[PDB]
Amino acid sequence: APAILLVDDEPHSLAAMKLALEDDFDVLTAQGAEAAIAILEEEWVQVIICDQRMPGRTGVDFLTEVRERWPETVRIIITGYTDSASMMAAINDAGIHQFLTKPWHPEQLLSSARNAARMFTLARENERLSLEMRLLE
């Protein structure tokens, strides 16, 4: 089953985000870029959420690669420093579907999640149709 990947510098927000999502998804949790890529390798992930402000590699960077190695996956950013334009510009260059502000309702953040996974589902069958309708003409 498609899980959701949680990826934040502070391990107390993975803790939280899980508490909000665990009841509905298979939550996978990671402490940063290099740590997280490791997981998308072995396990299968429908949705990912990433702190932007992370030591070393930023969410936007991580996700530029995620976009490249596993394009079937819905990418989401999350920020408490929502006031910066540089960021948004960065966000707006990458293929980032949702950007959430901190903090967040257990039921809101939960929703941006159910979204992503419904979306991941559309996109994924939206492609099936194609592939299979190619194998006709």
Which of 101/121 has CB closer to ligand BEF?
Answer: 101
Q: Does 53 bind Mg ion (CB under 5 A)?
A: yes
Q: CB of residue 59 vs ligand BEF: minimum separation in angstroms?
A: 7
64 binds, among ligand BEF, Mg ion, its own copies, none (CB under 5 to 8 A by kind): none
Segment lying near its own copies (by CB under 8 A), choices 2-10, 41-49, 64-72, 110-118: 110-118
Which of 69/105 has CB closer to its own copies?
Answer: 105
32, 79, 109, 111 from 103: Cα distances, Å: 19, 8, 9, 14
109: closest CA among 35, 34, 8? 8
Helix 85-93 to helix 59-69 angle (10° resolution) is: 0
37, 54, 125 from 113: Cα distances, Å: 20, 21, 19
Q: Which two tokens stand for residue 47?
A: 């949705």
Q: CB of residue 99 vs its own copies: minimum separation in angstroms?
A: 5
In the region spanning residues 17 to 36, those forming contacts with ligand BEF, defined by CB under 6 A, are none
Whether 68 contacts 37, CB under 8 Å = no
Among 37, 88, 94, 117, binds its own copies (CB under 8 A): 88
Which of 94/100 has CB closer to its own copies?
Answer: 100
Q: Does 78 bind ligand BEF (CB under 6 A)?
A: yes
- Residue 30 per-residue DSSP state: E
